[PDB]
Amino acid sequence: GFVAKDDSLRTFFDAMALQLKEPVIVSKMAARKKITGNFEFHDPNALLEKLSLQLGLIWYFDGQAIYIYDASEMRNAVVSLRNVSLNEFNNFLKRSGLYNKNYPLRGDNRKGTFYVSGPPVYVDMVVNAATMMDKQNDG
Amino acid sequence: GFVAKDDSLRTFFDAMALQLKEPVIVSKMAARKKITGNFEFHDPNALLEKLSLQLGLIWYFDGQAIYIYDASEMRNAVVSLRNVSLNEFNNFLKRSGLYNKNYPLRGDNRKGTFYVSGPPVYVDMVVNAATMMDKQNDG
Amino acid sequence: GFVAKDDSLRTFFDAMALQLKEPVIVSKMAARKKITGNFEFHDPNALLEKLSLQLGLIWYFDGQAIYIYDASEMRNAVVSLRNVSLNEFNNFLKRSGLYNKNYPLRGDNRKGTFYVSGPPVYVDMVVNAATMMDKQNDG
Amino acid sequence: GFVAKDDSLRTFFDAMALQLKEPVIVSKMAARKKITGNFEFHDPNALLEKLSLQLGLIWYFDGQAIYIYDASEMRNAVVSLRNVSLNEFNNFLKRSGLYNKNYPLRGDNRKGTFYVSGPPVYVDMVVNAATMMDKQNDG
């Protein structure tokens, strides 16, 4: 695996990227911080979720690459959904493979809106998809 | 065949291109990465699909040349199909020889749209063809 | 005939042109590539079709000169034919001596269009002729 | 006659012009090519048709001068003939002395058009005459 001794997170996630196929893109904000410890590379994704609790990093795999950001870079959005059922759009993203259970969407079956919270690429994916799906049924 | 010892992918795919008739065009992003290993050239296409799992490369043969890109260069598109049946257009591309089973199109027989995902030339081919076929029946 | 020993295709097709009456015009893209082997000049046209399988060259004789291009220079076009039967225009070109069986036209007797594929001069000849014939019956 | 030993076609046709009354005008494209062989000047016109098969030269005598061009300089045209019968205009040119049996016009008695093919002066003569004759009966 890898023993980090005050090494940058970028160095650390590059060492993790050596065990991965897809590219790993670490934000500048995360790259500036350092990490120390003996980290077994049996499951790089478990390290990513581990540092959500240890350092406060968030990430999203979009199917082609792993984006790693600081949790303070997390984006929030308010998205109305007039022509699509809130449960229907949730299933749509789950069916699409875009939805991420680590960053749940905050809907309300008594209202016509929902909230998006997550890393910048996760938020952009949900919000763009929501726009597409609502306007698609607009007629 | 060819024994790669930290050689660029461009070098590697040029060595594969020596066994091929058509030109092989490797993206700059792929050309910058390197490859190591003993690769038998009994089937260059099997090496191309192999590196979809080993390195994360995608490709498309358009009938005249082989385009090789990084999987992160993969393009996505949202294409409506109002005047052509989704199954009819799928068969059209399969009949045309444009459709590629390695990059399936994502249709839905309960909706009037479908999604395109693949390397930049595969996406452009499907999307341009979709535009042609829909507008063609627009009247 | 001619023994090519790493000679340019232009040199090679010039040696073939010595046995021909009409001029042979080789593209720059083809001229840049080289060729090796003992080539009997008993039938220059058989060498031209041979290199469609060996090197991946395409060509067209327009009645006055032989155009030689790389297969990657091949052009494609989408041509509607509203006022002329698809079989009638096929026969027209066959009757005209413009049609080339090495580069078949892709029609469909259930539709009002057809596709053109071939070297740049073959495509331009079919497409210009198609325009002429359709507009000719437009009234 | 004249024994050509790698002499320009212009030199060669100048030697033929010495046996002719009318001037002989050779294109620059033809003038640049050379010719070798023992050519009897018993019939300069037979040499002109001979080189249509040997070198690929085309020519036209317009009554006042002999124009000699390369066959690749051959022009083609599409000419409609609305107010004159296709056979009537053919006879007109045959009667006029403009028509040349070495470069037949391509008519169709089931259509209202015909095609012109020949050296630049032959094509211009037929096409200008066609314009004259059609517009002449336009009323």
Author numbering:
A (entry chain D), B (entry chain C), C (entry chain B), D (entry chain A): 34 to 172
Give verbatim excerpts from the published study on this entry:
The bacterial injectisome, or type III secretion system (T3SS), is a specialized syringe-shaped protein-export system utilized by many pathogenic Gram-negative bacteria for the injection of virulence proteins (effectors) into host cells. The major structural scaffold of the basal body is comprised largely of three proteins that arrange into a series of highly oligomerized, concentric rings: two intimately associated proteins localized to the IM - PrgK/EscJ/MxiJ and PrgH/EscD/MxiG, and a third protein belonging to the secretin family of OM proteins, InvG/EscC/MxiD (Salmonella enterica serovar Typhimurium SPI-1, Enteropathogenic Escherichia coli (EPEC) LEE and Shigella dysenteriae nomenclature, respectively).
The stoichiometry of the T3SS OM secretin has been a matter of debate, with numbers between 12 and 14 proposed and recent studies favouring 12 for the secretins of other systems. We therefore generated ring models with stoichiometries of 12, 14 and 15. Use of the higher resolution map, however, clearly favours the 15-mer assembly, with the 14-mer configuration having significantly worse correlation to the EM map and Rosetta energy. Using the high-resolution map, the modelling converged on two opposite modes – a “helix in” conformation and a “helix out” conformation” referring to the orientation of the helix in the N1 domain of InvG. The “helix in” mode shows excellent agreement with our previous biotinylation and cross-linking experiments, and better fit with the EM map. Mutation of Gln97 within the loop (which forms a hydrogen bond with the adjacent molecule) to leucine – but not alanine - abrogates secretion (top).
